[PDB]
Design a protein around this ligand. Structure first.
Ligand SMILES: *C/C(=C/c1ccc(C#C)cc1)C(=O)OC
Length: 138
């Protein structure tokens, strides 16, 4: 039955540069990151409240495994290691709060939502700034 599980390809990306800006990424690298973001692909396998998620671009790929409700370790959009904890906000929306392992920096979080007409929306927040990325099934 249809859930988050699937192969997703990006079709829109709003506010990504502004998010990197907040994270201290210089202009040249942000522009390269924006260009790379248009090949974001996401693969999700979901069973119950257990998730496997592989995000990749042209040159880079990462995998995370988590269970809703259980702390896990990942990294921030700008690659700082963090501790993460995902909770449901509705049937097909989940929200993750992150805390830096070492250091200080902006407050980061992310969401994933399956909409009623079959999109996956990702949002990523750093302080006041919200990047939204929309995906459709491959
Ligand atoms: C789930 C997830 C997807 C994602 C897309 C793009 C980037 C970048 C850079 C990172 C992740 C996530 O939690 O990212 C914050």
């Amino acid at each position: 039955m249809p859930n988050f599980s699937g192969n997703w390809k990006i079709i829109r990306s709003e506010n990504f540069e502004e998010l990197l800006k907040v994270l201290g990424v210089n202009v040249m690298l942000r522009k390269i990151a924006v260009a790379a973001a248009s090949k974001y692909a996401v693969e999700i396998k979901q069973e119950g409240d257990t998730f496997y998620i592989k995000v990749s671009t042209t040159v880079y790929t990462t995998e995370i495994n988590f269970k809703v409700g259980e702390e896990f370790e990942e990294q921030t959009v700008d690659g700082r290691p963090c501790k993460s904890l995902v909770k449901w906000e509705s049937e097909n929306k989940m929200v993750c709060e992150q805390k830096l392992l070492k250091g200080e920096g902006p407050k980061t979080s992310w969401t994933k939502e399956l909409t009623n007409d079959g999109e996956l929306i990702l949002t990523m927040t750093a302080d006041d700034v919200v990047c939204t990325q929309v995906f459709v099934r491959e």
